[PDB]
Design a binder for this molecule. Structure first.
Ligand SMILES: O=P(O)(O)C[C@H]1O[C@H](CO)[C@@H](O)[C@H](O)[C@H]1O
Ligand SMILES: [Mg+2]
Length: 448
């Protein structure tokens, strides 16, 4: 009874039965009715169908009197940046990010790149598109091509003092997504020596779909770091709004620890600022933010919640453990580029390896990583967990599912808003043994 491609935060589906040019044009028409006055920025990723879906979007938008600013093949963050920079009414990125070959999708924003989500306009668009049987009208507005990335590149470079950068050797792995175009445009302005892996955009994805979380894709970056003696490695998803770090030993760094690391990096430039973090893994971030003189602000996980809380708090930075990093001056939006520029500067200025910058934090606050469970009855499973631990009287917080703080250890257990899954995160106060026994205990209870 409902179009399956319309999800909580974006549109995503198999082409062509769940998403196609006709739906894309109808989405353009419906989006025009939902935005304030102004033109609409469109960009797309490397997938084979993405240009044609963008063209259909543009045709619907222009049939509805919206001028279209075509920024071309880009990363999702460039749609965010240009929507805000050009003071557009909104923007759409055509992308499936990390999904398989036969999938595509769209990420929609309104003014200042504010997200459009299921409860803030996306399901309104879905319902309009679902009932729209009108004949396609003809264009009454224009499309302008604006592929200049100069303002975007200057904005990225403004986060670091380039005279303090050292000629680090960096592995970069675009995964045949789009990140390599931006790296290559930044490189004339940077002293780094880049080691390029899976660098060329290829929507056929000959080296695997761009998802650095798959261990086999992870190992391509690790090996390049180790074989070339690189200072660290960076990998991106296909639309490069997520970045992933490998230290000089080839070790993939759990994203939890990048939140505290980037917060300290930013707070050095913006003293006393607020930093937004999610509730899944917290202790390390709270401590690092406070030690840097910042103020940590707890917020439900999900990019729309993070961005809204950052805005209401004038927070300079927000970070999620799931490799999303948000920057006030970047229209409160996430970037897969700003994070590694900041880390490169921190390594250059401190004389410490990425490994040593996080090592003590990982020992002090070891974490399970996010563990997902598909169970027969999520509500019953969660109840089994809470009944088992009731006699210990944990401190409970319901910001985002259930957070339970036992003193020396804590967990977060929540339902995903994008998949029918339970997600589990556990951390402890410097106790790897406790981390494992509690994680396994909860896992058995969930699976019971
Ligand atoms: O499925 P979940 O866990 O509700 C939402 C997931 O996707 C969101 C958008 O990519 C992320 O902001 C969030 O951190 C992540 O857990
Ligand atoms: Mg992505």
């Amino acid at each position: 009874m409902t179009l399956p491609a319309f999800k909580a935060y974006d549109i995503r589906g198999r082409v062509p039965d769940e998403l196609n040019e006709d739906l894309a044009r109808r989405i353009g028409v419906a989006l025009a009715a939902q935005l304030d006055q102004g033109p609409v920025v469109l960009g797309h990723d490397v997938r084979l169908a993405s240009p044609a879906l963008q063209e259909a979007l543009s045709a619907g938008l222009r049939a509805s009197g919206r001028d279209v600013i075509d920024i071309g093949l880009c990363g999702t963050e460039e749609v965010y940046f240009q929507t805000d920079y050009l003071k557009a009414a909104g923007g759409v990125m055509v992308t499936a990010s990390h999904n398989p070959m036969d999938y595509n999708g769209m990420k929609l924003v309104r003014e200042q790149a504010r997200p459009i989500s299921s409860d803030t306009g996306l399901f309104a668009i879905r319902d309009t598109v679902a009932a729209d049987t009108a004949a396609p009208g003809e264009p009454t507005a224009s499309e302008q091509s604006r592929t200049d990335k100069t303002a975007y590149l200057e904005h990225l470079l403004s986060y670091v003092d380039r005279s303090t950068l050292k000629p680090l050797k960096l592995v970069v792995n675009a995964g045949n997504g789009g990140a390599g175009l931006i790296v290559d445009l930044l490189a004339p302005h940077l002293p780094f020596e880049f080691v390029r892996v899976f660098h060329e955009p290829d929507g056929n994805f000959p080296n695997g779909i761009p998802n650095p979380l798959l261990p086999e894709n992870r190992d391509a970056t690790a090996k390049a770091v180790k074989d070339n003696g690189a200072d660290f490695g960076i990998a991106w998803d296909g639309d490069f709004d997520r970045c992933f770090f490998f230290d000089h030993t080839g070790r993939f760094i759990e994203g939890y620890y990048l939140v505290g690391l980037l917060a300290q990096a930013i707070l050095a430039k913006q003293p006393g600022g607020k930093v937004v973090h999610d509730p899944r893994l917290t202790w390390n971030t709270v401590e690092q933010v406070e030690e840097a003189g910042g103020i940590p602000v707890l917020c439900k996980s999900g990019h729309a919640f993070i961005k809204e809380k950052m805005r209401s708090e004038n927070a300079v930075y927000g970070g999620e453990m799931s490799a999303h990093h948000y920057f006030r001056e970047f229209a409160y939006a996430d970037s897969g580029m700003i994070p590694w520029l900041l880390i490169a500067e921190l390594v250059s200025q401190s004389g410490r390896s990425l490994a040593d910058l996080v090592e003590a934090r990982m020992q002090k606050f070891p974490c399970s990583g996010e563990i997902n469970f598909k169970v027969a009855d999520a509500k019953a499973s969660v109840a089994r967990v809470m009944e088992h631990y009731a006699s210990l009287s944990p401190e409970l917080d319901y910001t985002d599912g259930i957070s339970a703080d036992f003193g020396q250890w804590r967990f977060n257990l929540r339902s995903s808003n994008t998949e029918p899954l339970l997600r589990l995160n556990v951390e402890t106060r410097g106790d790897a043994a406790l981390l494992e026994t509690r994680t396994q205990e909860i896992s058995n209870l969930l699976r019971g």
